[PDB]
């Protein structure tokens, strides 16, 4: 049970007990998967307009 | 002085960062018009309370913080509610449709053609911060922006700020107060994609929240204001060292250091006490040993689980009024021979504690009892998978049938994210187990 | 309209109880996945408590305290005991153990041999009986090379413990036997032991001199019942009830069932589910427990009662399926879950 | 400003449609005139989904009115709301449909359809967002079956991205103007799985029992059952015309398969003319749940429930209301799929319909409603097989080819509700 590390000021205090010792994506790629989703949007949607026009 | 800037992205994380800023304003002495009597220094400084607050020439003390929907209806509150001044429109983000609970509208049809405004918007504040220490990301699991668009901005914001701390306040769903039945695959879907660019996330069950409002603040049915301002209370709580003199939790590069020891497993359980109803004739003030043995009861955590079957890998103490070292650390032996409270053997057995003399304000009219002291304890449990088991296991009933896979697919995403975010989840399963079994 | 599911189809008590809680046409089973219940007959392995007490509207009530293995398993216990203060490594009531794990794998060898070597220094009685959880796999043997040689061929960890060397013998025969008590505890942690329990004998003379038939040694109903050349010779089934077991107690040693075994029996029962009440007790969790245990004990010829384990999942006698089942639901599922006595159980009082 | 555009078309579309309209501005305060005349702010919150604001203050419904003959759309002129209605918005030809779907879908149908699409575009045009379509119409017939669905298959190339639903009128021999009813109804039908996110189901032969076995009206006409579509029709557009919706949100939460979106609405109470007495909230609970309370006729105890919403509208106890649900829920668990968790959700709406302290309406997606498009389905092949009344729609070009392809699609989707019962 032992306390270190107190420290004090006018609003407060804090301390540590210690009661037993111990024993990314880029900019580019981000671009590519936004654009390689829009792109499967567009694919279906040009499908439906085939499908609509047939 | 280091500054701190806020982000709400969807409905959830708007109306609590709604209801933070309310909050915040009372806490420091900060009027509905900005204005903020006790700041001596008129149009600068760099007080604690400056890491969240900026200031004008005239006197206003403005949040460092920007909001960000995909539908104006719930921004258009903060436009014209009490604390409307705080702001200028410039800090307010709206479109006209929202992501519809669909992760795959948020994050790749909808979040493509706004993220460069939203990052714009960043930037300004950025530029008026001598030393920006990070992000703090507010939104929920479960709505199509708060869990599609939010994923996409940390995945920018890590690109555009390397080398900033980023850390997150999440609500996990609940059914008692949705009517949506897809976010379990938002949930999984978010958590996969941001896992890699968050710091630090304090998830808050609204299932928790729910019931410690029926149960402790006498609400047969809460609503998301009753939520919202009890959230707003653990959040100032975990904020308060960001915004006060002190010297614990001083940097948002601390919460990771003293809760965060294996980067994946970075989802510490918040508990807090004493939440005591207002219209209670009178109620008896709870002791130090009390609030802090209530920190280990499973009825006041923000996520409902049973610590005594997990270990601790890191547990913070955070009091807020009339308390004092001695009594602290007297009412922890006491826990300490009577609760379950096993630590990782590469852990030392401690608590950081942190106290700040200012008693918890409560938000006039509001739901809560004035207390003269309150506490709120950060505990890195791995009992907390319970609550990703929890949340895997609707996602694998919903799945196994494909079922409401098309409207993501709809929105151009490929339906190998869902098994991909899936086995990332399943990994995290397993991360937490070879840690806290034996 | 209640309803329950059944997710442990090889259990023979809880069978039992579904079938009666059926019969009462207030309860409905669901099927073993359907996360709408009331009430769950949980599998006995790896039971998700982490999905329970999650349904808005629901009280979901659970057949396992989540926990209970640390009084369940072989090795556990051991440790339990020793290094729990409310029993103490001074327990007067249960055999000298110690956990020792194989070489091929904290472990208690070179204590064990510490206090081997003083009993046969000491021309004390020094045998010992090795076995695990993992057995249908059982040694006894007086020499500590055979036993930790023994543990070593296998691949689980085993626990050695002081063997009885003076049971008490039941007369004519000249039989081992131990005792057997059910304990069921519900959702408000109140401790029932069950009126009725059960004497598993040996229909065997009782030998000394050798260790190697452990069918003297061993009262296991499977035991008897397959390598047992006299089952069921002195009573049906090799099982004596306590009516004719006390009555034996008063005609031979002059004394009766409760007062010079039954009390030391509560006692334990006591000791052991008090002291884990902290770690298991399901008082304010967002879910209920309650679970039926099998107490297993020895009784030496100083009427001394002894701990021997602790079943989590027993079975009970064929004679006594119906009145021990119904009063599972009386007072562990009905008080939770009413419907539209003189109780069987003898209410253990205690401080929770 | 989430605007919606209505379309009715057709005889049974436009009389279902204008009482509709007159159900919902009663509800907002809007007088046979256009004028507000309300008493509360909930009531023009959401005005503006369904109506447009003109000049001096007036609101008009954001509605297009379509037909092949004028008689039923001279009569909503000249009914009770008639004068609300925007005059342009009449698009009407005069030769009619002869209740013959290749006229509504190829012939006179075609002829008509390019103008009204004009409306549609002017409509849509003067939206701040377009949430979607709403069509009211029947299958039984000519012009709502045929046209109606050759309209939705041009305002989806038009507006792909926007959420298309309709409430569908499915005909029934019990309640029947022609024989061919079943060839007009099949023929939609597979229009409808393609290109509607929703479609509301409504059946006339249930119609029709609720009126003679429940409301005990001795000989039910069509006004009369109307009384119920409208009545419907209010319950269900509660989420979206007052706080608390999105068309597509309740897509995304309702509709797990993008071909099965066809769902059984339900309305409590129905009382018969006792009508005063105060409705409990497990009265509405029950009846709301009861199969009397159905209006797609199929018996829910005969599939499972894949998605559920349930609307209560009146100043009630929302935590009874909860009660009451999980009560529900948690005694028959059997009729719910059990691989879509949480799948019955609730809501709440302090104005209630008028006349009536509180009243819950009932959105549910099962499986049972396999057996309304197998009744279609026997229907269509007992006359098809002989080729029977085939010449009216051969004369309108059309193959029997086509009919082959409609009997083999809806017999496809009867197939797919069948897999997800079991
Ligand atoms: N605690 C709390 N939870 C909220 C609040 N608002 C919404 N939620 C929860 O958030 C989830 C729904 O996601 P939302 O945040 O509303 O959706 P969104 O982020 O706006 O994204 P959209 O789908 O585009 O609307 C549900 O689980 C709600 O219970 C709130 O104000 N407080
Ligand atoms: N220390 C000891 N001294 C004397 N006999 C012992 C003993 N330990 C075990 N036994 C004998 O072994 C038998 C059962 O052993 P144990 O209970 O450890 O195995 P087990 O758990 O597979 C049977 P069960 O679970 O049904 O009680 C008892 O009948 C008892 O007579
Ligand atoms: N509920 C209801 N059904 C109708 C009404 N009018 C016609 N129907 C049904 O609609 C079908 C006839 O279609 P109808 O609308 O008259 O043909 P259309 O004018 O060419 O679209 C038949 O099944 C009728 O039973 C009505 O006013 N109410
Ligand atoms: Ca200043
Ligand atoms: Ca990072
Ligand atoms: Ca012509
Ligand atoms: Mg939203
Ligand atoms: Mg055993
Ligand atoms: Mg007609």
């Known amino acids: ?54 | ?438 | ?352 | 400003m989430r605007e919606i555009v209505h379309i009715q078309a057709g005889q049974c579309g436009n009389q279902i449609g204008a009482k509709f309209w007159e159900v919902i501005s009663d509800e907002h305060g809007i007088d046979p005139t256009g004028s507000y005349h309300g008493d509360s702010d909930l009531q023009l919150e959401r005005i503006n989904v369904y109506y447009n604001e003109a000049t001096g203050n007036k609101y008009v419904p954001r509605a297009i009115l379509v037909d092949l003959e004028p008689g039923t759309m001279d009569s909503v002129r000249s009914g009770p709301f008639g004068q609300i209605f925007r005059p342009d918005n009449f698009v009407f030809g005069q030769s009619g449909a002869g209740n013959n779907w290749a006229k509504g879908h190829y012939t006179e149908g075609a002829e008509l359809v390019d103008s009204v699409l004009d409306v549609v575009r002017k409509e849509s045009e003067s939206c701040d967002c377009l949430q979607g379509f709403q069509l009211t119409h029947s299958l039984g017939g000519g012009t709502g079956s045929g046209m109606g669905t050759l309209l939705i298959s041009k305002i989806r190339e038009e507006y792909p991205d926007r959420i298309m639903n309709t409430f569908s009128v499915m005909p029934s021999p019990k309640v029947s103007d022609t024989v061919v009813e079943p060839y007009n109804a099949t023929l939609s039908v597979h229009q409808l799985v393609e290109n509607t996110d929703e479609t509301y189901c409504i059946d006339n032969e249930a119609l029709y029992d609720i009126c003679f076995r429940t409301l005990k009206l001795t000989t039910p006409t069509y006004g009369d059952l109307n009384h119920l579509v409208s009545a419907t029709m209010s319950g269900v557009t509660t989420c979206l015309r007052f706080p608390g919706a999105d068309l597509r949100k309740l897509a995304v939460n309702m509709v797990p398969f993008p071909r099965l979106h066809f769902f059984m609405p339900g309305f409590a109470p129905l009382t018969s003319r006792q009508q005063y007495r105060a409705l409990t909230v497990p009265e509405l609970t029950q009846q709301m749940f009861d199969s009397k309370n159905m209006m797609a006729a199929c018996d829910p105890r005969h599939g499972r429930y894949l998605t559920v919403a349930a609307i209560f509208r009146g100043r009630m106890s929302m935590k009874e209301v909860d009660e009451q649900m999980l009560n529900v829920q948690n005694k028959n668990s059997s009729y719910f799929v059990e691989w879509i968790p949480n799948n019955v959700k609730t809501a709440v709406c302090d104005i209630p319909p008028r006349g009536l302290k509180m009243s819950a309406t009932f959105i549910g997606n099962s499986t049972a409603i396999q057996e309304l498009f197998k009744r279609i389905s026997e229907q269509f092949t007992a006359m098809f097989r002989r080729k029977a009344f085939l010449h009216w729609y051969t004369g309108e070009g059309m193959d029997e080819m086509e009919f082959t392809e409609a009997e083999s699609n809806m017999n496809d989707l009867v197939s797919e509700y069948q897999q997800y019962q079991d």
């Open chain 3, 1 to 352: 309209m209640y309803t329950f599911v059944v997710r442990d189809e090889n259990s023979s008590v809880y069978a039992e109880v579904s079938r009666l809680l059926l019969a009462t046409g207030q309860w409905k089973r669901l099927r073993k996945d359907n996360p709408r219940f009331n009430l769950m007959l949980g599998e006995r392995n790896r039971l998700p408590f982490g999905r329970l007490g999650h349904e808005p509207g629901l009280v979901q009530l659970v057949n396992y305290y989540r926990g209970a293995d640390k009084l369940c398993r072989k090795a556990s216990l051991v440790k339990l005991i020793k290094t729990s203060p409310e029993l103490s490594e001074s327990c007067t009531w249960f055999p000298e153990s110690y956990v020792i794990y194989p070489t091929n794998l904290t472990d208690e060898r070179e204590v064990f041999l510490a206090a081997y070597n003083r009993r046969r220094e000491g021309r004390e009685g020094n045998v010992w009986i090795a076995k695990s959880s993992a057995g249908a796999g059982i040694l006894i043997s007086s020499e500590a090379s055979e036993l930790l040689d023994f543990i070593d061929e296998q691949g689980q960890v085993h626990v050695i413990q002081k063997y009885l060397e003076k049971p008490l013998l039941l007369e004519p025969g000249h039989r081992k036997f131990d005792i057997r008590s059910w304990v069921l505890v519900d959702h408000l942690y109140n401790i029932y032991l069950y009126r009725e329990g059960v004497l598993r004998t040996s229909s065997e003379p009782y030998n000394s001199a050798n260790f190697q038939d452990k069918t003297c040694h061993l009262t296991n109903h499977c035991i008897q019942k397959e390598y047992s050349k006299n089952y069921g010779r002195y009573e049906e089934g090799n099982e004596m009830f306590f009516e004719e077991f006390n009555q034996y107690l008063m005609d031979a040693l002059n004394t009766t069932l409760e007062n010079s075994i039954l009390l030391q029996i509560k006692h334990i029962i006591r000791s052991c589910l008090m002291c884990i009440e902290p770690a298991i007790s399901t008082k304010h969790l967002h879910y209920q427990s309650f679970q039926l245990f099998g107490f297993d004990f020895m009784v030496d010829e100083e009427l001394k009662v002894w701990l021997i384990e602790v079943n989590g999942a027993p079975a009970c006698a064929q004679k006594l399926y119906a009145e021990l089942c119904q009063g599972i639901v009386d007072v562990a599922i009905s008080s939770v879950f009413p419907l539209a006595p003189t109780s069987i159980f003898i209410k253990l009082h205690h401080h929770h």
């Open chain 2, 1 to 438: 002085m280091r500054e701190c800037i806020s982000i709400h992205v969807g409905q959830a994380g708007v109306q609590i960062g709604n209801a933070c800023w309310e909050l915040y304003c009372l806490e420091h002495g900060i009027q509905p018009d900005g204005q903020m009597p006790s700041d001596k220094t008129i149009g600068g400084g760099d007080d604690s309370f400056n890491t969240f607050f900026s200031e004008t020439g005239a006197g206003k003390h403005v949040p460092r913080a920007v909001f960000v929907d995909l539908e104006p209806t719930v921004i258009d509150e903060v436009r014209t509610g009490t604390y409307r001044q705080l702001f200028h429109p410039e800090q307010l983000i709206t479109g006209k449709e929202d992501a519809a609970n669909n992760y795959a509208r948020g994050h790749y049809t909808i979040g493509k053609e706004i993220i460069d405004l939203v990052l714009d918007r960043i930037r300004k504040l950025a530029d008026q911060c001598t030393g920006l220490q990070g992000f703090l990301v507010f939104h929920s699991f479960g709505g199509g922006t708060g869990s599609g668009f939010t994923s996409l901005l940390m995945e920018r914001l890590s690109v555009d700020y390397g080398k900033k701390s980023k850390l997150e306040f999440s609500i996990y769903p609940a059914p008692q107060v949705s009517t949506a039945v897809v976010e379990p695959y938002n949930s999984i879907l978010t958590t996969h994609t941001t896992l890699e660019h968050s710091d630090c996330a304090f998830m808050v069950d609204n299932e928790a929240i729910y019931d410690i409002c029926r149960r402790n603040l006498d609400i047969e049915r809460p609503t998301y204001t009753n939520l919202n301002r009890l959230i707003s209370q653990i959040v100032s709580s975990i904020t308060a060292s960001l915004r006060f003199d002190g010297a614990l939790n001083v940097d948002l590069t601390e919460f990771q250091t003293n809760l965060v020891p294996y980067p994946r497993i970075h989802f510490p359980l918040a508990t807090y006490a004493p939440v005591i109803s207002a219209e209670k004739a009178y109620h008896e003030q709870l002791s130090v040993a009390e609030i802090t043995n209530a920190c280990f009861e499973p009825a006041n955590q923000m996520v409902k689980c049973d610590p005594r079957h997990g270990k601790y890998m890191a547990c913070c103490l955070l009091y807020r009024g009339d308390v004092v070292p001695k009594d602290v650390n007297a009412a922890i032996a006491t826990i300490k021979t009577k609760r379950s409270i096993q630590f990782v053997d590469w852990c030392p057995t401690g608590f950081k504690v942190g106290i700040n003399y200012q008693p918890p304000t409560v938000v006039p009219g509001g739901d809560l009892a004035k207390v003269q002291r309150a506490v709120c304890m950060l505990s890195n449990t791995t009992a907390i998978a319970e609550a990703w088991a929890r949340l895997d296991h609707k996602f694998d009933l919903m799945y196994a049938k494909r079922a409401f896979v098309h409207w993501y697919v709809g929105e151009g995403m490929e339906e190998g994210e869902f098994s991909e975010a899936r086995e990332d989840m399943a990994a995290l399963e397993k991360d937490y187990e070879e840690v806290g079994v034996d």
């Open chain 1, 1 to 54: 049970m032992e306390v270190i590390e107190l420290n004090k000021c006018t609003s407060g205090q804090s301390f540590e007990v210690i009661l037993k010792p111990p024993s990314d994506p880029s900019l580019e790629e981000i671009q590519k998967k936004l654009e390689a989703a829009e792109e499967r949007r567009k694919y279906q949607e040009a499908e439906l307009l085939k499908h609509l026009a047939e």
